[PDB]
Symmetry: C2
Subunit: 254 residues, 2 copies
Amino acid sequence: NNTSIHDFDFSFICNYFKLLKRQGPGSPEATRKAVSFINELTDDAKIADIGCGTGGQTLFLADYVKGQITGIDLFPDFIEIFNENAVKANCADRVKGITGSMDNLPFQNEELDLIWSEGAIYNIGFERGMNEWSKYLKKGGFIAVSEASWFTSERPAEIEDFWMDAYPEISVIPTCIDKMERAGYTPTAHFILPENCWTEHYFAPQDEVRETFMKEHAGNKTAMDFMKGQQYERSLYSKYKDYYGYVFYIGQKR
Amino acid sequence: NNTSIHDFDFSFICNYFKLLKRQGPGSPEATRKAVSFINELTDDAKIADIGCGTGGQTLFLADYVKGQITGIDLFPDFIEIFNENAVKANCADRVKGITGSMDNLPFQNEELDLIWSEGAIYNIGFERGMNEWSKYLKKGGFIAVSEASWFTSERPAEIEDFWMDAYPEISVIPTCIDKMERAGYTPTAHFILPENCWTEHYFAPQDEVRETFMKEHAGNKTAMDFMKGQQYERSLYSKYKDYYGYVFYIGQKR
């Protein structure tokens, strides 16, 4: 009970993450590195960041590429924060957030030059996203998504159980690449995100908001179980990091 | 007859390539990009470039990384050229070439910080190199090799026949990554080399030496069949490039 991520209201899991810049591992270097594999864009390019959350990673993407960037998320609270940050970053003219589904995007067929997504705020699955987002991408356009992947053929039961529950579609890197290619994209590149994408840019920032959050919800049993949960995930990383991590996959629609 | 690369003396195939800087696709950008995935080195690092040929790619590697770089090749003519170029590049103090086998290197166990190899001058196979060169690499050190790979699940019979003859161990990218990981390296990254690694840095340079070579060997039937052969490979690229190419694979010994 309360040991699984599936055991929490969505308006609850988000009431916590709206306090953070990133809802998943990542970094300015990792984003910059993924961009080094796509074609250069102009101010007239159309880019979509699916499951943008509060937009932390979306703003770093805007520093490395030109074009109109539309951030899409299911939770309206995240979008509200996203537009506030774009305003605070003085780029709300080219960086806009809207609410919407990840499996039925508000775009025309072949309207985008780039599709971007870094594991955060719900997930429809790697294979499904590869095949479904395709229609919205111009031919020759690029897709770049970061995802939790297995780094070995087999791992300790503890980490496997964890993922078979949190995200059952997690697979070895070879399988992700195979799925990217079958979805019609040339598998341009893949690279494992450095440890700092986890510790420095994801876990640490949570140490900041911890205090206020605890003071406020120390009386709420469900909230304290959520916290013990996040702390569990952090300790799972320090312990099993050699068996899993985030991987950036970049591909070009054929 | 003479339609296969296996139909030519080795002292013959090399009498042609010693006239070129690269014996295979590649570029300063592709080399620079592979280096962006390994750890920074000092002047005391030990690096080995297996199957270096005349050293064209080895000198670009020396521009992006510090350390003593030893280029290794089977053919003594290539090594002689390699050391001449290092001299012409004023770096023969840190960049040296020696003759030797690719499957029994002149190094101690865990002596190297980096192992490098870009498809050129014979090949022992991806899987075999991954497993055999390991012993010479320090734990945590990196390996970075570029190799011809299939980009799709199936291709036209013409290109398949060609490779099943030229290099039968050619496989899809997922299989290469799987082999890298089983050999004990964390599969850090992979990326397809841009077209210019083929046209600009590999095929074009051959247009330069063509004239003199032809004048000299126009009377030699075996030499003219070798030339028609290279021209065939160039035309195979323009025709089947969407089905194959070179891929840089970078990994970290666990």
